[PDB]
Amino acid sequence: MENFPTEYFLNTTVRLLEYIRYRDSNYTREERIENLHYAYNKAAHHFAQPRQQQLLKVDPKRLQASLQTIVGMVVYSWAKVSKECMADLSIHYTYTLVLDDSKDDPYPTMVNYFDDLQAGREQAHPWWALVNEHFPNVLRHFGPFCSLNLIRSTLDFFEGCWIEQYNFGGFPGSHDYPQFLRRMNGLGHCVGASLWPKEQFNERSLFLEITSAIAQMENWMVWVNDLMSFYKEFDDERDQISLVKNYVVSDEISLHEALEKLTQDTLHSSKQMVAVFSDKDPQVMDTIECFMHGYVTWHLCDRRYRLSEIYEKVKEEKTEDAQKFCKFYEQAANVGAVSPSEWAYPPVAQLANV
Amino acid sequence: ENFPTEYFLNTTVRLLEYIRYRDSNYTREERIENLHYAYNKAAHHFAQPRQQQLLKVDPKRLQASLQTIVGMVVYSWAKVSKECMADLSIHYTYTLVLDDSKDDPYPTMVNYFDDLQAGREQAHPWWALVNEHFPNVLRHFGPFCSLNLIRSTLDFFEGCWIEQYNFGGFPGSHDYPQFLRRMNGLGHCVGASLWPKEQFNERSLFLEITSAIAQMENWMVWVNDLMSFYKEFDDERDQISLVKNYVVSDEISLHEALEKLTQDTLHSSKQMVAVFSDKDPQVMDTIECFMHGYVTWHLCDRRYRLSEIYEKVKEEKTEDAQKFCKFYEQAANVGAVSPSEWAYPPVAQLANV
Ligand SMILES: [Mg+2]
Ligand SMILES: [Mg+2]
Numbered sequence: 109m110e111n112f113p114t115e116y117f118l119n120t121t122v123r124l125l126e127y128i129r130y131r132d133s134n135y136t137r138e139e140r141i142e143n144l145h146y147a148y149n150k151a152a153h154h155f156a157q158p159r160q161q162q163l164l165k166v167d168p169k170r171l172q173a174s175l176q177t178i179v180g181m182v183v184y185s186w187a188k189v190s191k192e193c194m195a196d197l198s199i200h201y202t203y204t205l206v207l208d209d210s211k212d213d214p215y216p217t218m219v220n221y222f223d224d225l226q227a228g229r230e231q232a233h234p235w236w237a238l239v240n241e242h243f244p245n246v247l248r249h250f251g252p253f254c255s256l257n258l259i260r261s262t263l264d265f266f267e268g269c270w271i272e273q274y275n276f277g278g279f280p281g282s283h284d285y286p287q288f289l290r291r292m293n294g295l296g297h298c299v300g301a302s303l304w305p306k307e308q309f310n311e312r313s314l315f316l317e318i319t320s321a322i323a324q325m326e327n328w329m330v331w332v333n334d335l336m337s338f339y340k341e342f343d344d345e346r347d348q349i350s351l352v353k354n355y356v357v358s359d360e361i362s363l364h365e366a367l368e369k370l371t372q373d374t375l376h377s378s379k380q381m382v383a384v385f386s387d388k389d390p391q392v393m394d395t396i397e398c399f400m401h402g403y404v405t406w407h408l409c410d411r412r413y414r415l416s417e418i419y420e421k422v423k424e425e426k427t428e429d430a431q432k433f434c435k436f437y438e439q440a441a442n443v444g445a446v447s448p449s450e451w452a453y454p455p456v457a458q459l460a461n462v
Numbered sequence: 463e464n465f466p467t468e469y470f471l472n473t474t475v476r477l478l479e480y481i482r483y484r485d486s487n488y489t490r491e492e493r494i495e496n497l498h499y500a501y502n503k504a505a506h507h508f509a510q511p512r513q514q515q516l517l518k519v520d521p522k523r524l525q526a527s528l529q530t531i532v533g534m535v536v537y538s539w540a541k542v543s544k545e546c547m548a549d550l551s552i553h554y555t556y557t558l559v560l561d562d563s564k565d566d567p568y569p570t571m572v573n574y575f576d577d578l579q580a581g582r583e584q585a586h587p588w589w590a591l592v593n594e595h596f597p598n599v600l601r602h603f604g605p606f607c608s609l610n611l612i613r614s615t616l617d618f619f620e621g622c623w624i625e626q627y628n629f630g631g632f633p634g635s636h637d638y639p640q641f642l643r644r645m646n647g648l649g650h651c652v653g654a655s656l657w658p659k660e661q662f663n664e665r666s667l668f669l670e671i672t673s674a675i676a677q678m679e680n681w682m683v684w685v686n687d688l689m690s691f692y693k694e695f696d697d698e699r700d701q702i703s704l705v706k707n708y709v710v711s712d713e714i715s716l717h718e719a720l721e722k723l724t725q726d727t728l729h730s731s732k733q734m735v736a737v738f739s740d741k742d743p744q745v746m747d748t749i750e751c752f753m754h755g756y757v758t759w760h761l762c763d764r765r766y767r768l769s770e771i772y773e774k775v776k777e778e779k780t781e782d783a784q785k786f787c788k789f790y791e792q793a794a795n796v797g798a799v800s801p802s803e804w805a806y807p808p809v810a811q812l813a814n815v
């Protein structure tokens with residue numbers, strides 16, 4: 109496995125896109141830009157505040173980059189939620205993304221977690237201090253059940269980052285470890301339940317569909333990301349513990365086999381995703397369908413994933429896949445390719461300095 | 463419907479035989495010592511007026527649950543201190559009192575986070591009691607393990623909420639069954655509560671502890687799904703079970719579901735030993751003891767009425783009814799203990815006083 113399985117990749121991707129029913133939609137480039145800037149502007153103002161500036165140890169250049177990656181992700185996948193919602197979620201998911209920048213052992217700051225929590229004293233760990241303080245702005249858009257899911261998944265996430273600080277791919281033969289870990293820092297339930305604002309949905313009325321959405325969406329969302337970010341992560345010696353890389357270490361199988369395990373779960377996930385929801389409430393299947401499409405557009409458009417390289421390579425090849433891929437790609441670009449100068453400004457730093 | 467008394471025998475035999483069920487840790491004297499210590503502390507706790515007032519539970523059931531839990535803890539957390547067994551017994555008794563309950567959480571969970579962040583007592587009486595008591599359990603652990611207990615308990619509360627809808631998942635929702643089982647499984651709570659900071663160093667054994675939690679989560683729940691593949695059947699409140707949901711969600715026969723479970727269970731057991739054998743001795747010990755005690759407890763405890771089986775095939779000359787009874791015996795040798803020896807006085811009696 110010296111070269112990238114380009115062939116195999118293009119195929120799986122095209123399949124994924126077909127299974128999910130990837131296709132044109134109602135978001136218009138004008139609307140995308142409207143939201144991108146709204147969400148970005150609110151967040152940027154937030155992170156530019158002195159208190160946030162002070163407690164969130166992050167290289168500005170990176171905070172800037174992360175915020176933009178997150179706004180884009182939210183605005184493109186949470187298509188049916190309100191602008192405020194996109195903004196508030198953008199702030200939350202930007203906090204979670206930023207946490208992977210800390211080597212700082214949580215232990216000492218997590219020693220009085222529960223006692224402080226129960227007492228109502230600000231957490232020792234600055235991340236929690238900021239996140240928990242801001243949480244209400246996200247939580248207000250949801251009902252009690254969904255809120256609990258966001259709260260849990262975020263706590264889960266904090267631990268997942270803790271575990272990852274050990275750059276540990278699992279003991280050989282620890283088959284349960286890889287997914288255990290992936291699920292932990294996957295924020296699956298956060299994503300899954302944040303898709304159902306109480307302004308547009310009734311938690312109690314759609315409890316079974318929402319729950320089922322969360323349950324299924326958790327895996328789809330994470331595996332689609334593991335697959336998409338598999339091209340950028342291929343020749344990157346820095347990223348040592350990914351789901352695929354851990355399957356290799358824990359299950360004791362080849363990278364190809366692991367990559368195989370992933371695609372099968374991903375494709376199967378996609379199939380059942382559509383199967384279960386097609387005939388369900390229209391408004392639900394819509395949010396679901398839009399999340400998947402936007403989530404894939406976002407992966408395809410954001411440079412972070414360097415997929416444009418996969419495109420420029422097979423750009424001409426006359427294979428069904430290669431052509432099926434290139435078509436889909438252009439699809440995304442027509443609505444997903446947007447210069448940051450159109451929405452992401454001014455820079456967070458600039459707002460912070462003022 | 464008809465209970466797979468035949469199939470039930472089958473699987474049970476396979477596992478018991480593979481994992482090699484053999485509880486030889488602990489002496490009956492020691493078991494009774496702990497049983498009564500744990501029971502006594504808990505019983506005094508639940509008998510308190512405040513607990514008596516906020517925890518809506520039929521006394522007869524609270525009494526039964528407490529005993530089921532003390533036994534579970536004392537028999538599986540063999541290497542933890544007496545206090546630890548007790549405090550854990552109180553925590554897991556709170557969770558059990560919930561596990562078999564009815565009451566929409568929604569209204570009381572409406573200000574969960576705001577109250578939490580403010581430090582105001584939760585609206586839901588269960589949280590009000592549990593969160594108040596939590597420190598007694600959490601003191602026995604380090605920060606990492608504590609986080610795992612806190613998370614898994616929160617997860618559990620949601621799991622019970624979901625179960626109140628008696629929903630086995632939409633047909634074709636393959637991910638739903640395990641999603642749910644994991645939620646109300648308390649896997650991480652169990653898994654991390656096995657490593658008291660008095661006997662272990664969270665930082666020194668982080669990788670082993672984490673791996674233990676990761677693997678133990680599934681073993682623990684699947685072993686219970688298999689063992690209780692009897693008392694949860696006909697039962698109404700336990701209608702939506704992992705196996706029963708596999709049937710509804712994966713659209714397969716009860717046999718296929720049951721077959722799937724054993725495959726996971728056996729494979730889990732396999733890798734459990736594989737990964738840990740050559741690891742720190744003290745770790746493999748806690749792990750090995752939990753598994754054995756956890757199985758001893760299942761064969762012996764009432765709640766799982768596996769008795770109405772030793773005596774329903776104590777005549778059937780099959781090998782499934784003679785492999786089942788070969789163990790069911792071997793177990794009650796050290797695990798069969800009359801409650802009159804440890805569980806007294808009754809919680810109610812302590813409460814009335
Ligand atoms: Mg349960
Ligand atoms: Mg069960």
Ligand SMILES: [Mg+2]
Pocket residue numbers: 561700
């Ligand atoms: Mg139960």
